[PDB]
């Protein structure tokens, strides 16, 4: 179906109040001091102080 | 009062006469008393009850101190039973000794949850046809309300969603056997919830 009246700025912006981002699962490698996602192989290829690739 | 145990699957036992008695085996750890809520300090009267085997790393310091007033070293969960008149000390042990043969009981517990159920499954609605010209609608709900002057949909309308794990109680199930050695209760009938769950056993008031 279609609408009978357009939604105003307040009504539109209220809907997208629950639309945010969060990925703060970072961790610092003990050896290389490289930032990486937790429980993930680091971009260089180290996981808990061990080269794997 | 009542007893908290675990559902552990159903079984069957045969008497000497020959009839088959479907049985639900309920494991009961010995239950410790955590509190005795007197009337003067709390209004109503009730007793807390707890099962065991929770690791020390999973209990908060507040709960550890709560289980320190009575030397319980308590475990998972805390349950409370309302009772008429019976004294209980801070540290006590509630076992299956209060039950006997017969002794119809009420068995509660979280039922097995269906993810998101339709109206045919949740409310036992009847479906439309399947061949006689029917359009895509084969299992969907039909009408909701009247045309012009309800002006809306009446609250409490039966619609689809979440045949859930909400608490439900089967009424007046008779106990077949009580084991004071293995700490088991044999209940004649079904028990809500899956095996390995949590179940509450209380004397039946409906009689």
């Amino acid at each position: 179906a279609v609408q009978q009246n357009k939604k105003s700025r307040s009504a539109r912006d209220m809907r997208r109040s629950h639309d945010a981002l969060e990925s703060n699962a970072l961790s610092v490698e003990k050896s290389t001091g490289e930032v990486h996602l937790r429980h993930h192989v680091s971009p260089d290829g180290f996981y808990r102080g061990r080269k794997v690739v | 009062i009542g007893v908290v145990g675990r559902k552990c699957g159903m079984t069957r036992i045969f008497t000497e006469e020959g009839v088959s008695i479907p049985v639900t085996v309920i494991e009961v750890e010995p239950n410790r008393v955590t509190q005795f809520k007197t009337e003067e300090t709390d209004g109503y009267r009730a007793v807390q009850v707890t099962a065991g085997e929770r690791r020390a790393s999973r209990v908060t310091k507040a709960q550890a101190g709560h289980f320190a007033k009575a030397n319980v070293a308590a475990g998972r969960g805390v349950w409370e039973f309302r009772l008429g008149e019976e004294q209980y000390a801070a540290g006590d042990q509630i076992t299956v000794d209060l039950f006997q043969a017969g002794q119809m009981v009420d068995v509660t517990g979280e039922s097995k949850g269906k993810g998101f159920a339709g109206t045919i499954k949740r409310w036992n609605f009847r479906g439309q046809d399947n061949t006689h010209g029917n359009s895509v609608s084969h299992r969907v709900p039909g009408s909701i309300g009247q045309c012009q002057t309800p002006g809306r949909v009446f609250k409490g309308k039966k619609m689809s969603g979440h045949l859930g794990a909400e608490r439900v109680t089967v009424q007046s199930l008779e106990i077949v056997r009580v084991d004071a050695e293995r700490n088991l209760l044999l209940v004649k009938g079904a028990v809500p919830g899956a095996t390995g769950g949590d179940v509450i056993v209380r004397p039946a008031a409906k009689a």
């Binding site: - | 552990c8 079984t11 069957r12 045969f14 000497e16 006469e17 020959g18 088959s20």
Partner: protein
């Protein structure tokens, strides 16, 4: 194991070793008229479960020109005796194909003696 352990107490030896395709005879208790008696039910076994206490077999009999198949519980005290009169090779677990064959076509072969 608690449910696997309760069943062991109800298990008491009542049956011999048998398999599908045998022609067993079963003695079943009859409680009628305030007098207990046995009754002979002879047929051909067509199914078997081996769950433990939840074990059951199905035996097919042709009585008065009418077929009849009776499912029996293995460890019930109603099933008193179980004797094997014939055993033959069928190389299959469930002989449900015999529900259609009646006479000479429904003969159990004999490779096993």
């Amino acid at each position: 194991k608690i449910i696997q352990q309760i069943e062991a107490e109800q298990m008491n030896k009542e049956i011999p070793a048998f398999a599908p395709g045998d022609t067993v005879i079963v003695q079943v208790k009859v409680k009628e008229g305030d007098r207990q008696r046995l009754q002979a039910f002879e047929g051909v076994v067509i199914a078997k479960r081996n769950r433990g206490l939840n074990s059951a077999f199905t035996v097919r009999k042709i009585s008065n020109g009418v077929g009849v198949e009776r499912t029996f519980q293995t460890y019930s005290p109603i099933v008193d005796s179980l004797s094997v009169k014939r055993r033959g090779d069928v190389r299959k677990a469930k002989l449900y194909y015999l529900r259609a064959l009646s006479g000479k076509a429904a003969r159990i072969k004999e490779k096993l003696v």
